[PDB]
A paper describes a structure:
Using genetic suppressor, structural, and biochemical analyses, we provide evidence to support that C. diphtheriae encodes TsdA as a compensatory thiol-disulfide oxidoreductase safeguarding oxidative protein folding in this actinobacterium against thermal stress. The overall structure represents a typical DsbA/MdbA protein family fold, including a thioredoxin-like domain and an α-helical domain, which are found in actinobacterial MdbA proteins. Clearly, these results altogether demonstrate that TsdA is a potent thiol-disulfide oxidoreductase that when expressed at a sufficient level is capable of replacing the major oxidative protein-folding enzyme MdbA in C. diphtheriae, and that its enzymatic activity requires the conserved catalytic CxxC motif. Given our finding that tsdA expression is upregulated under heat stress, we propose that TsdA is a stress-adaptive thiol-disulfide oxidoreductase that protects corynebacteria under stress conditions.
Residue numbers in the entry: 38 to 282
The structure:
């Protein structure tokens, strides 16, 4: 009785960060995307790592492409979150503003989670124009900063902000986009039209129809569910698969 034993294992509802605690952090690609030869980034990246043919192929949604300027976190993180999102969507804004920072702090910054953005424009012309602007920011390595500036500007909006070019230019300046002539041209011209069509067709082929939508490891989540739900799923998925080889 004059001894201390190690903590008992508890049911997961009382176990706190057990998946995290036992997972192997990634060590590669923590410093951002790999640039192209000219120091710009491949803003035409979209899609899965490999075709999905059945439910058995669910992990294929996660690209783990070191060149991807739409991704944050270790390319060898044990868990990937694949997100399908729309820049006019208030549920997408709420996830970005209220859930993502917690996931950055608890998981991404520790090498445990990589988050990959995928365009799924549902809100019409403003959403397509915003996605084109996002790809123009990503070409200059500023996707994350652009996304945060735009969604923080939507933090009090219950509907759609109806952003247009001058809004996107402000978010790009806020984000530190260095070549504003290239940004403004690519935000408007045909550069990203093909890839946005292909991204939408890819999401529709998975049956993903509503934003935001997520594949957290092997688990699909529809909508801006509570932060605690994302944490529980992350912990569960890290328990199932603690290491990426
Ligand atoms: Cl596919």
């Amino acid at each position: 009785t004059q001894a201390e034993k190690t903590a008992t294992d508890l049911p997961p509802g009382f176990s706190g960060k057990a998946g995290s605690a036992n997972a192997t952090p990634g060590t590669k690609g923590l410093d951002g995307p790999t640039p192209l030869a000219d120091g710009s980034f491949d803003a035409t990246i979209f899609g899965p790592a490999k075709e999905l043919k059945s439910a058995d192929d669910i992990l294929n949604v996660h690209r783990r492409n070191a060149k991807d300027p739409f991704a944050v976190g270790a390319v060898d993180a044990p868990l990937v979150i694949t997100e399908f999102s729309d820049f006019e969507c208030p549920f997408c804004a709420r996830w970005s503003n209220q859930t993502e920072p917690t996931l950055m702090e608890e998981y991404v910054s520790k090498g445990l989670v990589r988050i990959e953005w995928n365009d799924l424009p549902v809100n019409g012309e403003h959403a397509l124009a915003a996605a084109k602007a996002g790809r123009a920011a990503a070409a200059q390595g500023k996707f994350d900063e652009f996304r945060k500036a735009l969604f923080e500007a939507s933090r009090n909006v219950s509907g759609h902000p109806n952003n247009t070019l001058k809004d996107f230019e402000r978010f790009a300046r806020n984000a530190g986009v260095k070549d504003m002539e290239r940004f403004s041209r690519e935000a408007q011209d045909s550069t990203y039209d093909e890839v946005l069509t292909k991204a939408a067709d890819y999401a529709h082929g998975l049956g993903v129809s509503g934003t935001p939508a997520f594949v957290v490891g092997t688990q699909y989540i529809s909508g801006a569910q509570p932060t605690e739900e994302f944490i529980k799923v992350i912990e569960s998925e890290l328990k199932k698969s603690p290491t990426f080889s």
